[PDB]
């Protein structure tokens, strides 16, 4: 029907102040939560993810025909997160914190 290597939902917010995203992740009391978002330009996105008592937005760029995740060029933002669900991102966090809290699972 309408599945895809994109589309879907709940992991990329396209509209909010670049600094209000720090207050939405600061309002949530817990260690570990990853999300993605769109900057104020269609030439770069950003992974908003906090851990412990700190917040860590991340800036991903897009080349004319590919994407620069950070140290490698990936084929798309969905395949990026696909092998990234198993690999680390920064020196400690990953996509290991989906909806997380004592009342999640």
């Amino acid at each position: 029907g309408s599945p895809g290597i994109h589309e879907s939902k709940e992991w990329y917010h396209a509209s909010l102040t670049r600094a209000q995203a720090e207050h939405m992740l600061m309002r949530v009391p817990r260690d570990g939560a990853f999300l993605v978002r769109k900057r104020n330009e269609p030439n770069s996105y950003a992974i908003s993810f906090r851990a412990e008592g700190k917040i860590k937005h991340c800036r991903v760029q897009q080349e004319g025909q590919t994407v620069m995740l950070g140290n490698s060029e990936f084929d798309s933002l969905v395949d990026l997160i696909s092998y990234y669900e198993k690999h680390p991102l920064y020196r400690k966090m990953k996509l290991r914190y989906p909806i997380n809290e004592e009342n999640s699972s």
Binding site: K56, C58, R59, P88, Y90
Partner: peptide, 12 residues
């Protein structure tokens, strides 16, 4: 400063 971190999985 903590408003963006380049996503690198350990410096190796």
């Amino acid at each position: 400063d903590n408003d963006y971190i380049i996503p690198l999985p350990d410096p190796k």
